[model samples]
Target: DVSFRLSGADPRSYGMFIKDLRNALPFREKVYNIPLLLPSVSGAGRYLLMHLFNRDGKTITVAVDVTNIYIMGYLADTTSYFFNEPAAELASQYVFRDARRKITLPYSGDYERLQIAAGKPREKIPIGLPALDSAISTLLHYDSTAAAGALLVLIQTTAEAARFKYIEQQIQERAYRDEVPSLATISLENSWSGLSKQIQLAQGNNGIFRTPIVLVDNKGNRVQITNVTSKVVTSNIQLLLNTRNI
Candidate 1:
């Protein structure tokens, strides 16, 4: 018999708390949901006992000692509404089976394989973005020849236009505020005696001007740019969806 004792503080602030737990636990026939609201402070010592039976006919008992009860008012309310109320009606449609009842278990092998198949493509899409950005930056820095090489590789790969559009939007909004300079402007500006000298002075060195630079190429036909940059930008836009830490 696989038996274990789990101890935790009493949950009595909300009536639904115990109800939710009872709905999740197995063997409701021998289990009790102890209502010990403020056990220590309220001078009521209460606890729950869980029992299990193994195939070998051995019986096991587990004691879970509980103490105080605290309420997470706002969070609890939100979860209740989202997972317990009418708003969660859609979830019932997708549930494999009712948690309250004993149901047939999913085949672990098939379930794991299905999960992996569904997840792999989504994972690959995001990782390819930074590499694509690096390629774009490299192309923009070197020349049409260098740009063509990177562009060719990008086109050959599974780079989606929608994904690139997302990346471009994110870079525009978060990475850089100023509009990006065009490839034409960058090449021309690098050749300019005065502008080159100014950049060298600003950088505090002359040879440093040869370093790769990435900027918003917000010049030329907005339509042309929207088409060209959309590929790279869109990927970054999708990246921003997971930017909660930022």
Candidate 2:
């Protein structure tokens, strides 16, 4: 059995608050047995309050309302509004240069080129949408080359519809043999929805809407549609003025 004793500075003298200390003892009939003791501290005044915890093989800590108190006044200060300036600068870089570079080649052209280069038949190639403004923009600002690589892989893998078929077959075989859910069975409905919805929503929704969306490779037992959507937004009047004058 295990036992513990808890005590603290008397709550009566500490503004009705308690400082809890704990001592743990192993249950055994030994006269020289000693209990393990742990200690912690808490705020004594009407300022910021904090809580702390201690245990064997575990060190846990948490702060309460510290951040709330710190930002309460600053959040209300209109003149000194907190802004992610670095993020803003990054967004600017994307809208100006990164977006242009990414969409320089059309989606069909990009996939077709890669497929031809990979020695795949033209009929096997499927082209979805070409715009990657948001991804490219984020990559430009965050220097996230891995994310960029993933985007590139997405383009390259589906460049040829036949390759997608082959991949689907492989996944199906694995899933059947293993009796588990496989990539082949899981429909990429989200991808399809993203593409279809973007096109549907873009219509008459202003220049901010993403358009020219299409789903490629919608058929074949081994493959499904590759949905594509736009990620660029034309500058509004306010945005234009901000950039032009400020």
Candidate 3:
């Protein structure tokens, strides 16, 4: 189940809010196949908050509240907050961001308190690692001539690096006989935190990363191909490249 709460705006705007949200979140059906359920809103405060819940009624643990629509709140898992949550011993803070701006809220339930919090401007946050971004730019450059067909393998551990190396050899061997999509690899540690934060600002999440491989577009949007453990990584990436809409 999902919950929605509105604040400091006309309650009637709920209609438009739902509309914009659904429009921006087409991946629910297009990608993950999760059914979209619209929930009713209660009284107002300052900003908007949407919470995802499990059938057991506890909040679902989400890594990031990535959205094009205006919705942000606390995640049940502090680790998933991507270095944003305050100390676990301290009172939980309400953190929210969209595209390029973010704000932390100690007190957001009350309109007056949120007014004071709003006095502070949301700060800009980095979207990805410098090296990773640079690699993606280079990949896009390569992809430009190859018809936007580029695949990136992100690794941090030695075993994953070994897998990447093996894949590189395979691609090279195939290159001798036939052509393959542009492939690049980068070493990225603490990727969960890195990507969790980046997704907060991405246009859409696609809920596809199950991310060792990623399909990035010219617009900077990406479809993450994760869980490279059991399945054949190359096949999965190829399938995503052929099947993904974005």
Candidate 4:
């Protein structure tokens, strides 16, 4: 008997990809018939692991990006496998069957075919004031916690707008409640531009730009969040302020 297991997928975020995988794997005529798709796109931030076992107890392990339908890498019985080279002939048994179509797997270019599906597009927040640009710059470059140290949210457009508005509301509410000595403590100017200026002054620079929401230092640094819900925004805000002693 052949056995397989899947892990490391966040159902809420990577639902579509998981659904595709679920549909593809269970119906395979043979274990090797599953082509082992992996992601070709860099946007995929999460990955899923596929563990397959043959009758002989040899195991195939694959890492697949959850954001798109593609295989990152695979190993058979602790030995690495690739699409090209004579050794690849061993892979022929693992022919790909298109998940979305009824056609057989491509006869050639299986590596290219590894990326069979594209990830859902993330929504970009609408922009008006340019001040937000400088804020992002400071957050990305000047802040002690740079982009690599920040949370990158890949959210939908409608959700992003709601979260942004809610965040704006929370700031105002806290200012009204005397939480941080008023919005003026951060900047007198409102909108993203003003926040940008505030960020620049704190980080020691000035400019104007851009998302995924990047949250950093509690001082003058501004935070941006993407793929956000109001709840996510609230929890993260609390986490940032309380944990970081902001």
Candidate 5:
């Protein structure tokens, strides 16, 4: 409840009131994400006795008849003089920045006034040490990149980060690992079965393959058989059929 004295201005001259809400506040970047903390009126040099949330992240509001949007006469109609409730307590106060800005209520003729009572608790959100540290660092304009990264880390860690992790899990589970046993070539020779267990399958042209079968020992002179193919199918499907009993 700081008192700033400024003479009232001509009612008709609404110039000097319009500006980029961007440049009006010195701490604009700090409150860019939470405009309520350091809010300011751009075109109206008006900060009527009002209620505004402070930058404290609490319900603590700077109290006064904060009636700026003069949509009605406290008549509770569609005059729309609706109060800008979002503009909360000043993290700190300087001026509303207007040539015709004033401390007195010249607009509403003191529509209402009273009270200097119980303080609304500053936002009581539990800020653990880490969180509090980040808040201080960001709020104090410590480091631009770090501050912004801090916010992004929170946002992602809370929401999108989990979302992406879920996506990755989904891909791993359903897309990659879920591939059924399909025809593919194996590389590099190994021990154990060595060349005997090896299978022939490849690209570029037709190919032959063998299977472990036939009358063994007595067939020392029997030659190994070969088959060929043009596509993925075998050259002789019938040859692979074991009709021994028949």
Candidate 6:
């Protein structure tokens, strides 16, 4: 095991340390590229953490035998407001955790199918606003289009406007009430906003796109998306009271 020594000529951050370690690992070119910077460090199983805050030796880059470790960015407080109690004084810290909970089970067909599905590659997916809530706003404000004719134009136009307004209201409401947004909403927030920007650009294109936007279905089917017709835009806002089969 090589000892890691801080460079005397140059400085190194935690990110650099991790890079140096990864470079020393097997298959320097073939291994996964490490993207982490300023990562947390923690120990597992006795934790006997060793450090060289200041050392006068050549650096050790490889992990040691006791270096079996786990690190994460978060750890629960365990309902204790306590801070920095000495290890000798503490009874347990949920301690080392259950080191043994191994179970071997045969995978049924369903389990194997789930595994295959999980490993399968996913196609490109656009962020989108939910259908029903959007319909709620547009249907109520009917006949708001530009004299209403180019049927496809009407659909394309309102879908963008509807989602734009939808996200705006969402942000405003959350701010007024001062509540945190769900993860799903946060994901859609940027997506819908970008779509809103594209929609704005799409406006001055004189109904002939420099590059037409296209959408793909979940089954990998491609469709050239145009402005929806006024017929389809007379959308149904019906809420599902009971969706059992689904």
> Model 5 over residues 1-246: C-alpha lDDT tens digits?
321111221111111211111123233221112111123344223333221111343211112222221111110011111122323213113223221321221122111210111111112122222342243334233233333333222221111111122212222232211221111110100110211121122112233344522211123433233333311123111111011111
What are the runs in model 2 whose C-alpha is more than 4 Å off?
A: 1-109, 121-246
Q: Model 6, which residues run further than 4 Å from truth?
A: 1-197, 218-220, 227-246
Scored by TM-score, the top model is 4
What TM-score would you give candidate 4 relative to the actual structure?
A: 0.21
**Count of residue pairs whose backbone atoms collide, per candidate:** 22, 1, 2, 17, 18, 8
- Writing each residue's lDDT as its tens digit, candidate 4 over 1-246 gives 112321221223233332344443221121112222222323223434454432233444444433232243344333343333332343333422112221122222221222231111111222211212222232222222221111111111111112133333433243212122223222211233323222223222212112243443233566553332323232322111011111
Candidate 6 local distance difference test against the native: 0.24
Clashing pairs in 2: 124-161
- Tens-place lDDT per residue, model 1, 68-106, is 111100011112111123212332333222233321112
Sorted by TM-score (best first), the order is 4, 6, 3, 2, 5, 1
Q: Model 3 over residues 30-52: C-alpha lDDT tens digits?
A: 21222221222222222233443
* Per-prediction TM-score to the true structure, in the order listed: 0.14, 0.17, 0.18, 0.21, 0.15, 0.18
Error of 2 at 206 (Å): 20
Q: What are the Cα lDDT values of the candidates? A: 0.25, 0.22, 0.26, 0.27, 0.22, 0.24
Worst 10 residues of 4 by lDDT: 237-246
Which residue segments of model 4 deviate by more than 4 Å? Answer: 1-45, 83-246
Q: Tens digit of lDDT per residue, candidate 6, span 164-243?
A: 23323333343212233333333332233222233334445633334433433222544343432211112211011111
Residue-level lDDT tens digits of model 2 in 70-146: 11100011111111233223222322221222212111223233344445432332311121122222223323223
